[model samples]
Target: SRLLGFDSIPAATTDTISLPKGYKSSVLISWGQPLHKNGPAFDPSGNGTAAAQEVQFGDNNDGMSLFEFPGEKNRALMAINNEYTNYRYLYPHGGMPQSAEDVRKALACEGVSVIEVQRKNGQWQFVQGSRYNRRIHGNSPLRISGPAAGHELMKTSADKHGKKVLGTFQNCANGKTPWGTYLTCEENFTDCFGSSNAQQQFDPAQKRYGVSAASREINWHPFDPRFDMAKNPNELNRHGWVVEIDPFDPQSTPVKRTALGRFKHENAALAETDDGRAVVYMGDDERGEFIYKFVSRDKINHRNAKANRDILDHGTLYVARFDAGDGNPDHPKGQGQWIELTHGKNGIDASSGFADQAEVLIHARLAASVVGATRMDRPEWIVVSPKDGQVYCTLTNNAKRGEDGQPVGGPNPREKNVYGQILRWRTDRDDHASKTFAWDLFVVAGNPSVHAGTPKGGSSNITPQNMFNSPDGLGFDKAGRLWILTDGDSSNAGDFAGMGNNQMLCADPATGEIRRFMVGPIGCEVTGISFSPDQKTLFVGIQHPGENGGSTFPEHLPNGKPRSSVMAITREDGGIVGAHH
Candidate 1:
């Protein structure tokens, strides 16, 4: 029997990828890995230019998914999202963050990369010369598809019809459809753009949200004035949409489905309704944000790969209003409602200020606010079980719990807190197209003591059973075992020092049994996860592995150098994982 445990050995200096016993891993792609055949290698120092980035693997790999081609045994397609970048590592001797050239390179890395990989002797590696390998950078021309494609709000100096956009932003966790297309989410797009007087300039009619153009992660405005949204009001609007990439054909242009709406999208979990219609459950990763789903107008023909490609184009998007079933003066874990965002329905109209369907989609956040959808603690990743038809979402965390002006009621009634909570829901009649559903707080992240705040406010549910923080990654094994990965806040390191760094946990949802499977190296965040069809190999993305304050780079002692890369974990006894644990 194979047992589950972790080895403290460092994997890399920039990132740490831990694994169970008997597993071997290597760095398939690094921050400066060449993307194109003729592209220059990535210079750890900031000597690389934006043009060079067009052919180089972007920094900060987040979510990824595998797509096997028809009739191909060992060859498969891999789509990776380059979430964000670190200026210090990318620039030369800490160059200016506001440089337009620097900003352009950073932008080039924010989209998706489609690469062909093959397994050799039970190990997977990218096929360097595969014709299918390609990159979709932020500057790549993308068509805006769906009902909101040509809306007025989307029109800008670049595209008067709102049908074309320059690039996508902050891709985080991802999802793949049975039809073989990749769905990359746009998370944390708000950090790229801002408004002058955000709260004051709030448009009652337009309900357009804006961040301060002055505040940017890389401060790219001083180098390029276009980075300043105050000078370019339409800049922020260009992002926040889910981008679809066709990996099979390298020549295919990536399409941003505007009909899916826009926000800090985490993942789009795809599944079919009782009627065979395509459905995608998505989360907007932010405090007090809302959960959403899109139901396609056309039925998904799993057998017909071509038809499935068009299914995502026409769909009805709905936001969730969770009533956590708490009947108390404050309803905790009440019954929930599904607010529709379709045209000519649910009190949405042109007079209501939405000129067209695209308008409602472009401003989905405002629509959710109008419908009074329940706000949630930063919802991150989502997964749907094809076997049981159960939907799971991770509400990472919320720091505004007790803050003034923010509601301290409902499921997220905590204030300025650290730990987060996970919520689960079952579609009515197990139908993905159902308008209503039931939900409850499945688990809360925190230690079981008075020290760490409890979700229920009392010390009753506090126990070793109640501890965990920031559920960032959620996936199901081939055997239906739920895998939970954590990203605990740095401040709580002392409380969890005994447990080492954030680790992966396994749970039997049916039995309510959970166990810690593996722990990562210091200062690393557990993000992406994928398993081979055989279930013999598991691949997890170790992101920002060795990121620590004070030290210029993560110290790689027992751990290898801190480098962000994918890890392949295999059972020691050549069996499925967690069998002995």
Candidate 2:
């Protein structure tokens, strides 16, 4: 079933979204929409209060998942993450927030939005006044759980026990667990915290996490001094974890499940082991950061959902180390192993500067460095194929090869790496829980037409039908089609002069054939792909629309502010989306 086998859409330049002729798309929900009963319409002037935003859809719709209410394929709960903010757009006069109110409004924009939207006939309609609709902003109180939940490093004057924190920020790509929970990953949270004239001695983890002397930070320290690491040094430790949320319960407090260990996480893709335990794959999204996985300690009762709500609380976290197979950069081959970072058995015990397993989990980056984990080039989103359980990760371009700033090798070695590529691997025992795996390069992003950013002799490979760069978000449909989202300058740069906008490409893993499925508006990033269970509806995230220019999209509101939105595409003829080639 070639669900995504559609006619290739051309790279676009105008401030318009381009899609296959047979398909039609409409804004399901744009940023700043009111989701609550009496919430005032979004004030794009950036003047909404935290109280008002708590009932509105947030900005920068990134990752999302659909929860179908049993037996009804047309009805579902939509849980999405507002990944980031455009500073200029969020504040007045094109500068940082000038007042405390501005700061609060900005804080309200960062977090997750859980709303009810159902498809009827053919279009998805946002349900107003639904009890399940809720917003978990960055300031929302979060209970800390799992091994590192109450470690000393996680404690601050605000949180004496280290078991509670304010909220989750920079929620990036996400995954839904078998138990019907959403795993929202925190990425680039360092954007919110900064310190100047630090009095606390910088530790190993602090140095690796990059604490610097600066001001004008997110300035969130005013709303909550915990954002100021200089005064509340341990507060930063409380963030950067995989947060678990049950969208089904609006009253549920999101939990920062630290058993998974933390870094600048990209996503938490999950698959159940043969024994009903959960296994999750995650990537640290930065140059030279390592990838990791977690195996839950508690087994899920496949029959009962309530028994597995806390499954992520206790788990064994492991980091990956990839080894070379034949060392060919063009058509490279490799093998990788998952190394356990257990408390005492793996030499990462209390004797090794870590006070306990909690300490080890809190300082995960330092533990990975000591355990010889392989550094990757800005590892981004990860996805597991439904057809064969193969894992695919997007390594967004990394300019500096390693921590030493030397040129890199093997998988990617381009100077100032202009284009990024995808890497795929299969488990050694064909099991998602296997510690060993074999891998190979899936598709390299480039333009064979001009030969600049691609592999040396790969000119015969790339073409307009499939050219893309900086693969950011990734997902696999039920029909086994790999959907790739891009984030890069797609302007007519001397290389691929006509690749005007970032796009979403659908590729076939079995045949190596790829097609450009859609392109976003100019100066926008196309990301976060997901599909309805019936495979007839598709939801694609349009991020930062009109970020670089004065353009209104999805709709022209009187406010004149561009918003990030999720586009729901369905066949114009009422047929399945992406159904024909």
Candidate 3:
């Protein structure tokens, strides 16, 4: 049965969202909205105080999840990751921080925002002053757990025990546990810190993780000493870990799980083994980086949620290596294996610059290289299909493929891969804990109209009507439809002609059929996906709309600035979203 019922929306570059005929979308929430009753309303002039921003929604809404109340059908909590801030819209001056106050406001705008929402009159609206509403920003207290928590490298002046750390920023994508916890991933954390010393030098591991003296993010170092590399060199190491939060309890402290390994994590896709052991799939969001998996040491206590609180803290981390093969002449396939990053095994001992398992996990990228893991094309999000349990990841474009050490073959078959591709792998014997797997390119996104009979034209699944690039955010609904969101070139020109502003696509994993589901507004990337319990409403995120500065979105206020927001889409007849067989 074909699940996609609506007509495929045309590619669009307009200032408003484009949807199918029977579906309508409304903004659930946008950046800078207040969650608490005492919080000040958003000021379009960008003169809001740092304290004000701390109480409001963070900027750049990314990966998110909607958790329904235990027995309440219409009430729920939305945990949205405020990935980063746009200085242009974040400040009155529309530039870098001019004072410590400015930096503080920027910090306040970069973490997880837990807001309460209730469906009233068939629409979702945020409830101010709700008990579950909370803002976990750059200054919020977060505990560090797992092997690397109290390691020497994790210690700093402000945190002597190395267990308690402040803040969880640069939170990109997210994950939700069956136990009702939210997982926010940290990416590009190095951009939050910088060095005051002109000649400051970063060590090998620091360089590998992208800790730099000349940081280019928001320049938070000048105002906050914690972000200054020379003052707190170890602080950079303290970040870049997945943060677990309990949305039900606002007073609960978020935890940074180090057992998952440290890197530029895009999202944590959680799955369970046959015996209920938790398995998580993660991708480091950088060119030539590696994909990772974590298998818990103990089975999950499904009956008691508290018993599994520390499950993520005790897991074995592994990296993937896709072996090249000539299965198909046109688009080659491959077999893959998972290499464990244990301290005493797989060349991760002390002589290999790893003193212990904590060190190996703290510098997981180094451990992956030591174990010969395959460098991927900017691995973004990993999702497991509910229908077949096959795992999928979005390799969201790599411009440096076929250059230096990264060869153009295997799962990553394109050189200077700008269009990106989807890599799918099936676990051996359907066991996620297995060490080996069979893999292939599910879909190589390309312009079939521009480059026919060439690698740039993409795989057979891609067509001009449903063509796109740089698949970033990925998810699976209850009906087994693969929802693909793009963060690629939205120029609608040159090689990307017909592929308009970044959009969301739906794919049938069973039949290799993909269709355009929705198209976003100008200068935005379609990301973050979720569905209500009944699957009647679909929630999607529009990020950085008008980031290049052209028009207003959602509000369309006169001379207004673009704000990233979450949209709630529902069918006219209230039918199941993407209904399937």
Candidate 4:
């Protein structure tokens, strides 16, 4: 059985980090920190320009990975996703972009950051002027790849060829490839786009994908012509795909892999089939959306990294359909199947508005609906177990779970699911590429103390000692311990009474025993888990601390603003992280 040696910490509502005994935490890097010698440090006045933000670390650091330098244990490259900018702390006036430069600065804060780091004095710190330090933001040039690259629907007035696109924004979560590349999944790209004409109507595809005439919070269309849907209608199609970045090569162009299908992608979890085929499991982190899987046509070439460069380009994308076989809210056990989203099959053809494979992938959500894919409760980050090939996904609540035509059974068993549940599935015959699987709920997060013996009390594993809501970030260590991070309501009032701030917890998949490992500061979500080569150091992301201007965290000063930062956690005595004894 797996063992977690650290003592479990209690729920906290403080403005500082809370950790168990025998562990220490320190801030590694904070938002607006310069990565180069020319860039200026963070301006507290909030008057930083777009050019300045381009060179500095972006806001809202989310999913990330640490790439070990070849033969250099102390040196490594860290590729992290800058999900989105918090307008309150980002601008001087604290509102939406009022000018074109404001739009540029906000856009510059999106996408990914690749920085070089080295262990010096037994502490990890980012290198200020390292050659590998780079940022791929909203307007950075990216190459379109796979079947949907050169489609007519992808063409715009500026780029008639449609092979080249500009930018990747709102990259929520990430994945690292065996070929040494970082995969950043774009989420909430629709927020950046809106119609300049307020009276303009959205098309069927646009409406289905949540594109609207009225701009949401970001409001980029007025200043940026590219985001104006009335002028550049096809531009909306360019941003919501998995972007492949080679951290080792700074000059290499980032490629958007369209074979992964378009949706509100939360994360890309990579795995290998029994026959060595490349497989990627993805979740569309929106209520009533579907989970997806991509199988590459070419087998993984572990030795020759060059040969696997374009392996993600040619693949088959499939959406999931979970069937409840005697499953209920108390026991969400089920069987599932992967329905192909490929063109010309399962009514995904010219008759159903999908002309070819490219169109099918471009509007993959529509293709999923045409094949009757199961609507999940906001499927978030997916992780594959290292000890076992079992796959797990976090369904981060759906208030509309039983509403309308949505099913409240199967893997998603709760109606009005506020506190989310973690669902795990194992492939038939242990084949990662299999179309069928058996599934069950790991734990349904809830406040057991408030509503004991009810569905709101969560599953049997939950206790008042280790209760959390909205389980989002999920990962597994080498020793088979599951690390669960939360992005939920921190009110600790009413229904969410005892659950304080967002935190991270460790679970033994074998014993189903969970323990709260660390609690983050106010208004921050504990996310982006990564570790050093020896597993001695753990990097955890504190995203958007004081996001709602609630409290000053990491720096509890009189009038200090909270900035997103990545923190390094380690056991005081040198030992493997999760198993320190």
Candidate 5:
């Protein structure tokens, strides 16, 4: 009934995943693995065809979950979101894919993958060629629905009715629905669009979404007109929406629930109110952006998939407005509000330059600013504790400073306000969708020796042996202990420093003590975590083992390129993860 404590593991610069003294781990599934019968072998040569990539698992995995079969604890469906790609050595010079054909192949590596897996002989293995296995890539068919589904702002030459979209984009963190469906958010969709004319780029909305005249991470516009704003401006607007997928039904086309509104959507965390309506918490994933939540209008239908599927389309969206509390206190406190972003609320409506409900949602960020939502310091992953209903969000880091140019981050930080912080809050009404709530800083991540972000006279709850920073990808087990995974500066492409390589930490809410449970490979992100129903197995995803040539880790091809994997972990004594003595 209390937090489970585990032995601490040391930090690392090597290319391997390290765990606690009594725990063990193994790679369960790796990138480019065959997902269907007769699927082609993963070509280590970096010269793969579009056809071969579709049948094979995608690269740079992020969010994932394990769902038990209807009546079997030994079998389950595993759904993973392929967040991005790092060119394999197969490419010429082992750099980013450049040729037109290479662009198409790269596109094949970005969406989502589904596979059936079974636990046999005490290990989990993905079943090859299972009927449930499939890949949803950048070119898969998708249906757009809700008030903004067919809006002119979403219209493009390909989707004249604005009702159809091509595939998923940057499917990062995840949210599970009460009806068993999944919601994968689009965190960095802004990185794809570029304009040819500088004069046409003054649109605040364009700059608001990070559109520009400069070259993008890749030139998708040269091969795909949809990526060019000059060719189809509305195409950029069509992305950044929350995509809903039915993992159980292979025949179903994924849907983009446009009603959730658009921004740098980080992840969705779902909870139900006392009256049974669904509530979803989201983060914008940027410096000075805001935290948001959506409350569905209809009550949840636990067994009806069709009825449950549309729950996301009828909600009211909101942004948080916080009032800072006494920061140096032994026990600190703060208050906040969930400002409504609706069309007819709080002096809003057709008079506010927004034409309709759809217009308001489409320009949600503008709507949020107009309503005076509180600006935060880079909000990322969010989760709700099923035990006490408290909501938590990670303000990864504030890389800027105050007017005096000194750091303006959480208390006791060592450097220039770079150590990240986590926020926790509860509703005044004890309702999952309450309009007003109270908050406080939960933990400020920093190096233990430096004691940055610690109090004036207290040592950090996490010492150097178990210290971690840049907290992201949050989850909670059935027993209520919160699991914190680090995307670190590696995920941010450097900036957060001093906290060597990324690692996973376990925290006790009452004590605010975080133990470094595991240290990941050199350049990878420790994301996505889940536990088996029997409580004997734990699963996690290792994304992009190497970028910036940091190091090829965990495992590499015969040619020496790193491979991302879904690593399975268990106790050496076969006890539950984070077991307390």
Candidate 6:
């Protein structure tokens, strides 16, 4: 069945989302659906106020998951991440520093929205007035957990102990644990907060990274003033950690687990070792950032809901340091190490400069850098295959090339250029609890024909068989089939103009075979893929469709729809996902 099932499905393109013949789909939610009764309908022309956004869905939906209701087959809870907003589409009039109301609205739009959904007539729709529906925005109070909580670096006017902080923002890719909690990651929070001169007041080691705050992209802080990082120095630290929310209970407080450590976190996927210890795989999402895993102190019992929830609270985090092999001695591949970052063990100091376990977690990236972890391409989404224990991560492109800068180091070498790569790792003895592991670059992304001669500097040669660029979203169906989504750089839009748009591809990772399955609308990105438990329905998030002056609807289709939305697709024959050609 494995070989025969894989042999099906010859790749082809259609004007819309293409699936095997028997598959059908419908819209679940779009860009501007109202989350609150007081919110106004979406005004695509950008005439709506930020206050209106407080109740409406934010633009550019990235990652999403459906939380099943206990003992209920037809009803489920939905949590979606609003990665970022499109300023031009939000404020169409083109104005200067947005007003305080605008900033407040933007803040409100950021974070996760939990909605109740139901399957009706073979289509999924949001269940209005469902008590399970709730939203966690940028202004909500959140508690910090684990080692980093209450650290000096996290102190602020609003949170004297650095333990309590305002809502989460810049949430991107995500995951759900066997325990049934949603893990939303903070990606690119640095884009909102610039460093303050008072940063010099910290230890010289902290100041070495530079004290320059990021220039505001939306300029909302200048008008609102509340977003001024200098006045609220600890605000930046509040974000960047993995936040866990229980969608089933609206009254539960969302937790930002400090044990996971912080950076531009992309996604957090949970897997378990043979001993049942919970392990979370995460990506830092920035160029030269490191990959991480958190091993829980206690074993997770999926049957015990309470115990499962508590498992995330205590864990030891580790970072990956890839050692490539080629007899170069100086540089090697195939072999790698998982450096431990624990409280009392593994060279970590628990006093003064280091303090304790929490301090190490709060300053995780700095610690990883000190330990010589491997720098990677822009690591994005991540997933663990149930069919096998292998873990997959998307290394979305890195433009910083050449010897002057950090350059392409370790497993990532397609430096300074646009094409990205994908990497896979297997735990030692298939045990998630093991500290040591081995890894290899699964595929290097690029236009294979164009970069065919590009020296990979390792065992594998660059070819069409092993190429892609900006590999973003990744997932494995129940059958263990791998799906790879693309978000190629738009600067070379002309070169791939004929390719239509960003796409989703199916690959048998074991055999190194790949096929393009679906293409998105112009100016849109393909992200956030999920499958129903029965494998009958496939959900794909189409973000920023017709975005940035790119459009194909009016000329090609009747409705001329332009808003971003979640799309549904299914196999034509209704067998498995790959049943049709």
List candidate 1 stretches off by more than 4 Å.
1-16, 194-210, 327-333, 404-410, 413-415, 449-466, 492-499, 549-561, 579-581
Give the Cα lDDT of each candidate. 0.70, 0.79, 0.90, 0.91, 0.77, 0.70
lDDT tens readout by residue for model 3, 246-302: 999889999999999999999999888988899999999999999999999999898
lDDT tens per residue, model 2, 1-581: 34555777888877677888888788889888889887778777766666676678888889898888777767789899998777777766666666666666677887999988887776787897889988898879999999887778888888899899997878998989888888899988877876645454667677787655453356565445667677888887888899989998899999999899878899988887767789999999987888898998888877899898778888789998887556565657788899998777667866677778887888888888778888777889999989888889988877676436433654554555667778888887777678899987787677665675446223233575567778888988887888888888767677556667888888787766678888888678987777877777899999889887656776777647788999988887776666663
Residues 464-575 of candidate 6: C-alpha lDDT, one tens digit per residue: 4333457799988877778888777544333232233577777776875566666666677888887766676777887776666555331344444466677777654555
Clashes of each: 42, 1, 0, 0, 5, 18
Per-model RMSD to reference: 3.9, 2.3, 1.3, 1.0, 2.9, 3.9
| lDDT agreement of model 3 with the native | 0.90
| Model 3 ranges off by over 4 Å | 327-331
- As for model 3, its CA RMSD to the true structure in angstroms is 1.3
TM-score of each: 0.89, 0.95, 0.98, 0.99, 0.93, 0.89
The 10 consecutive residues of candidate 4 with the worst lDDT sum are 324-333
Give the least accurate 10-residue stretch of model 6, judged by summed lDDT.
3-12
Candidate achieving higher lDDT, 1 or 4: 4
> Ten-residue segment with the worst summed lDDT in candidate 2?
452-461
Answer with 2 or 6, whichever has the higher lDDT.
Answer: 2
lDDT of 1: 0.70
Residue 407 accuracy (lDDT) in model 4:
73
Candidate 6's TM-score reads: 0.89
Candidate 1 lDDT over residue span 1-581, tens digit each:
12223332322222244555565555566655676666686565467888888777776778888786669778777788888876655666554465567778888777787777788986678776678877788778888887777776777776778788877768898989878889999887767764443343534422334455455555655565454555555656667888888888788877888879888899989888888888889999877788999989998787878776667788789999876367332124655667898656777777566767777888888877777787788888889875687888987878886665456655564566567766778888888888888776666555554354434332232245424567888988766777888877644445442334666776666654456655565566777788776666676766665565222223343523344566666775666655542
Candidate 5 segments exceeding 4 Å error: 88-90, 198-200, 329-331, 401-416, 451-459, 490-498, 556-559
**lDDT tens readout by residue for model 4, 1-581:** 34688888999999888998988999888889899976798897899999989888988999999999999988999999999999998999998889999999998998899999899978889899898999899989999999999999899999999899989899899999999999999999998888889888888999999987676777999989999999999999997999999999989999999999889999999999999999999999889999999999999999999889889999799999999757566557879999999888998899999989999999999999999999999999999999998999999999999998887788878799899999999999999989999998989888889989899899988999999999999988877889999999999898888889999999998778899999999999999999887888889999999988886767777899898999999888878888948
